[PDB]
Every structure is written in C-alpha cells, then in structure tokens.
Structure 1
Amino acid sequence: GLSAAADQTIKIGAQSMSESEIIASMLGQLIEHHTDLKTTTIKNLGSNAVQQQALMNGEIDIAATRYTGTALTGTLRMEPEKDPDKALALTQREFKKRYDLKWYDSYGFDNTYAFTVSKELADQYHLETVSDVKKWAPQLKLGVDNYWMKLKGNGYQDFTKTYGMTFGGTYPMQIGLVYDAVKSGKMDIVLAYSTDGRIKSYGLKMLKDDKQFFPPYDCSPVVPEKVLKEHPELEGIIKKMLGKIDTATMQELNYEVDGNLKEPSVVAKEYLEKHRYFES
C-alpha cells in the first residue's frame, strides 16, 4: 500500500546510446542525492518505440531521454511540426491526453539527425547545406543508423521527395560506427547524431538542413503521472535538471564516454560534482 511507496525502486530507462546512459545515471544520482528512493538503470532499450512500451507496461518508471521530433512522428503518428516550441508543446499535450505521461520541458539540448561529411570533402566541393549535395548525391555512399531506413514518417522516402535527391548507396549500421565510417572514407556522407562527441573531435562538418526537412529533436525525461503522484518529491528533483545542459555540454559528456573511455556513471558523477548538483 501507499505507506510502502518510499521503499519502491525507481527504474530509469536508457536507450542504446551513450547520451541516454549518461543522463539516466545523472538523474538516478540526483534522485538519490535528494531522497531515500533507490534507483536502477534499465539499459539497452532499442528505440523510441521500446521506451514507449516500457513506460506503458511498467518496465520503466522514467524514460531518461526522449526526443520530440522522434515521438511526434513515431509514437503519436502526427505530421512533423518544425518549430521547436510548437513541437514540444504539442508533444507534451498529446502525451498527457493520450497516455497520462508527463513529457517534461527539455534538459536544454537537441540531438538531431544531421547530414555529415569530412571537412576535406566539404572544403573541396564547397558544401555548406544539404541542398549543396544534390548534384553529387549519386556518387555518394550514405551511412545511416540501424533504425532510420524503416521509419515511415520523417524517413528516407520523404527526404528524397523534399530535397529531390537519392544517394548512390545507403548503408544502415549501428549509430556508433558512422563517425569512423565517414572519417576513414568508407562512407562519403553519414546521417549522424548532432550531440555525438566525435563530430568535433574527428574534424567532421554538419551540413545545414536548409529546407527544414527535420523536426526538432529537443531531449526530455518522460514519467507516468501515476509515478509522480505516488512519489510526490520526484517532480521537484526532475525540475533541477531542466534547461541546464546545452548541446555543447552534451557533446563534451558524450566525448568523455566514447572518446575518453569513461563509464557513463563516472561521467555523470563528475558532472554533478563540478556543478554542485545544480544548486550552489
């Protein structure tokens, strides 16, 4: 019954990404900093859709990182809203209405799909925007994640319609591999994730999505209203992380895992100590 609520463990989900492991660790540590709640991390959820079902079936009590553009198209099956503020507002409204899920305001960073080349390619062919690559598309191999080609929504098929180009070859692979694939010249162009730490490190160039094909992908935690009711301290704790972690910061945190070979929990703890757990 209710008087046992404070002895329940808060299960925090992470997708198969370094960024999601870092944020799920950081939120679990902040919750334990403030309360006597135990927390655990449920790792390796494969996708937006898996995080969704784990929230609805009790497998996780908090999804640490969900992305507006992904959930708009993929969960809600709505037309992709292009304005950041409108997309967030629509997502929060529909998540509450449809699922009784609370989609919080963003941590402060967006992690968008970004068409990405070597700085050498971009400098040789004067490539700044996605529209600049149109005339070259047939002679480029595009590396993509193991998930993006199968999206009916803001996927490849609609991309080719809006930009009127088709790549010579498309090669789906684990996201973590696209950075070295483009750096080594195995791929000519990759659909990277914009908060990856290796983009800067590896000397890569993101091309502007001048036609605004992509929705925003602002990142937030998502929690069932039932969990917030039963643990009324959680909302005030979650709020402490919101709007505090910008894209540059998330890139540096990702680099600590993928480039400096640190455990996501260690990266999360050192960030919390550097910033005094968000209140000094």
Structure 2
Amino acid sequence: GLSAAADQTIKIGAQSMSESEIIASMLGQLIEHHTDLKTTTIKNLGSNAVQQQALMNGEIDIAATRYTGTALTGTLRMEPEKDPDKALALTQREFKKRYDLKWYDSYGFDNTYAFTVSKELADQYHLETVSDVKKWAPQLKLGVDNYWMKLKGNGYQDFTKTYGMTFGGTYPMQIGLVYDAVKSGKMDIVLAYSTDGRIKSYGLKMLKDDKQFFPPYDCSPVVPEKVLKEHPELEGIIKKMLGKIDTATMQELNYEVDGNLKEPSVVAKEYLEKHRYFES
C-alpha cells in the first residue's frame, strides 16, 4: 500500500565503468542524506542497452549514468543529432513519449568516445585530428571497448563510411585496459572515453573529431515516472546534483578510482564531504 512506499528499496544501476559506479554511489548517499529511503547499487550492467532493459523490467529504479548520443543512436535508433542542447531535448521528449522515463538534465559533463594516441606518436607524425590519421590507418592497431565495433548506429561500420578509413587491426577489450594499451605501445590508437582520469595523467592526446562524426554524450540520471510519483521526494534530491559536476571534476574522480585505487563509494563520499552535499 502507498503508506508503505518509504519502505521499498531504491535500486540504482551502474554500468561497468568507474564513472558509473562513482555517480551511482554519490546519488545513493545523497538520497540517504535527505530521506529515510534505503538504496542499493546494481553493478556491472554491460551497456546502454542493458540499462534500458533493466529500467523497463524493474531490475533498477534509477539508471545513474546514461549518455544522450548513446541513447539517441542506440535505444531510440535515431540519426545522431550533433548539437548538445538539441540532442538532450530530443532524448528527453522521446524517452518520456516512448517509455514514460524521465531523462534528467545533465550532471554537467559529457563523456565522449575519442580517438586517442600517445603524445610521442602525435608529435612524430603531426597528428591533431582524426582525418590526420586516414593515410596511416592501415598501419595502425586500434584498441576499442567490447561494444562499439558491433553497434549498427554510429559504430565502427558508420565510422569507416564517414572518415573513409579502416584500421589495420582492431582489438576489443574492457575499456579500462585501453589506457595502458596505448601508453605501453601495444596499440597505436584507442577509442578512449574523454572523462577517463588517465588521459591527462598519462599525457595522451585526444584527436579532434574534425568531421563531427560523434554526437554529444552528456551524462544524466534516468528514472521511471512511476518511481518519481510513488517517491515524491526523489525529484528534489536528484535535482541537487544537476549541472554541478564538470568534465574536469569527473576526470579527477575517475582518476581517484582507477589511478589512486580508491573504492568508488569512498571517492563519492569524499567528494560529497568536500562540497557539503551540494548545499553550504
């Protein structure tokens, strides 16, 4: 019954990324700071598509981190809108229309796929943009996550159509591994994620996507409207995180996990303490 609503646990899902574990912990700890609700973390969801199915089948009550261009090309099966604002606004309307899901405004950061080389290779061959690598592509080994080569929309297939290049070799691996793979010289180029802490720490060079092949990847929490109606306090709490975490911040938090080997929960707790749980 409704009067027992506050006794239900709020299950917050995390994709298999350090970023998504940090944000899901941060949002869980903010909810518990403000309310009597219990929360749990539902970790290792493999991909955007898994998070979507978990929202629709009750596995998770909140997706902590979803990304506009991933949702636009992959869930919605729409062509990639290139403007951040327009892509957010389309994703929010289509998520509400199709699924009764509320896609919030962004936390403040975008986490894009980004073709990434060592500083040494970039310096040697004057590489600044992805188009710069077209003449070298047959001599390059690309390290990539275990999903993007297979994607029908805006994945490797469409990339080779847009840029007109095919890499000598492609090597799918857990995303976390690509940073040391390119830094150690095992891969020549990697499809990194821009918010990873190791891009700055390892001094890697992200190549400009000169053709704007990629859509924006602004990061937001997503919640079923039914969950918000039943727990009317959740909207005001989620709002406290929106627009508060910029790219530089998110990179520092990811570095604390992947570089400083802290637990995502501890990294999230230290950050909430530092910033007084977003109200001073």
Q: TM-score range by the shorter chain?
A: over 0.9
Once the two structures are superposed, residues 163-218 of structure 1 have per-residue CA deviations (whole angstroms, 9 ceiling, x without a partner) of 11111111111101000000000000000000000111111000000100000000
For 1:48-63, what aligned pairs fall within 5 Å after superposition? 48-63=48-63
Match of 1:105?
105
For residues 225-236 of structure 1, the aligned pairs below 5 Å read 225-236=225-236
**Secondary structure in 2 matching 1:80:** coil
The alpha carbon displacement at 1:161 in A equals 1.1
How many residues are treated as equivalent by the alignment?
Answer: 280
SS of corresponding position for 1:135: coil
Per-residue deviation, residues 77-122 of structure 1 (Å, max 9, x unmatched): 0011111001000000000000000000000000000000000000
Aligned-pair RMSD on alpha carbons?
0.4
Please list the CA deviations of residues 216-265 of structure 1 after superposition, one character each: whole Å capped at 9, or x if unmatched.
00000000000000000000000000000001100000000000010000
| Alpha-carbon distance between aligned partners in 2 of 1:15 and 1:152, rounded to the nearest angstrom | 20
How many angstroms apart in 2 are the aligned matches of 1:94 and 1:229? 19
Instruction: Provide the rounded CA distance (Å) in 1 between the counterparts of 2:171 and 2:203.
Output: 22
Take 1:143 and 1:43, find their aligned partners in 2: how far apart are those partners? 24
- Alpha-carbon deviation of 1:31? 0.3
TM-score (norm 1): 0.99
Q: CA deviation at 1:157?
A: 1.1
Normalised TM-score (structure 2): 0.99
Q: Secondary structure at the match of 1:109?
A: coil
Distance (whole Å) between structure 2 residues aligned to residue 16 and residue 169 of structure 1: 25
**Distance in 2 of aligned mates of 1:182 and 1:99:** 40
User: SS where residue 72 of structure 1 aligns?
Assistant: helix
- Structure 1 CA distance, aligned partners of 2:60 and 2:233? 18
What is the alpha-carbon distance in structure 1 between the residues aligned to residue 164 and residue 42 of structure 2?
41
Measure the CA separation in 2 of the matches of 1:152 and 1:158: 8
Q: Which residue of 2 aligns with 1:137?
A: 137
In the alignment, the residues of structure 1 paired with residue 169 and residue 45 of structure 2 have an alpha-carbon distance, to the nearest angstrom, of 29
Separation in 2, partners of 1:62, 1:161: 36
Question: 2:47 and 2:188 mapped to 1: Cα distance?
Answer: 26
Q: Distance in 1 between matches of 2:166 and 2:59?
A: 40
Quote the Cα distance in structure 2 between the aligned partners of 1:161 and 1:49: 24
- Give distance in 2, aligned partners of 1:22 and 1:10: 17
SS in 1 for 2:98: helix
Q: Give secondary structure in 1 for the equivalent of 2:28.
A: helix
Cα distance in 1 for residues equivalent to 2:105 and 2:86: 12
Correspondence for 1:181: 181
Which 5+ residue runs of structure 2 have no aligned equivalent? Answer: none
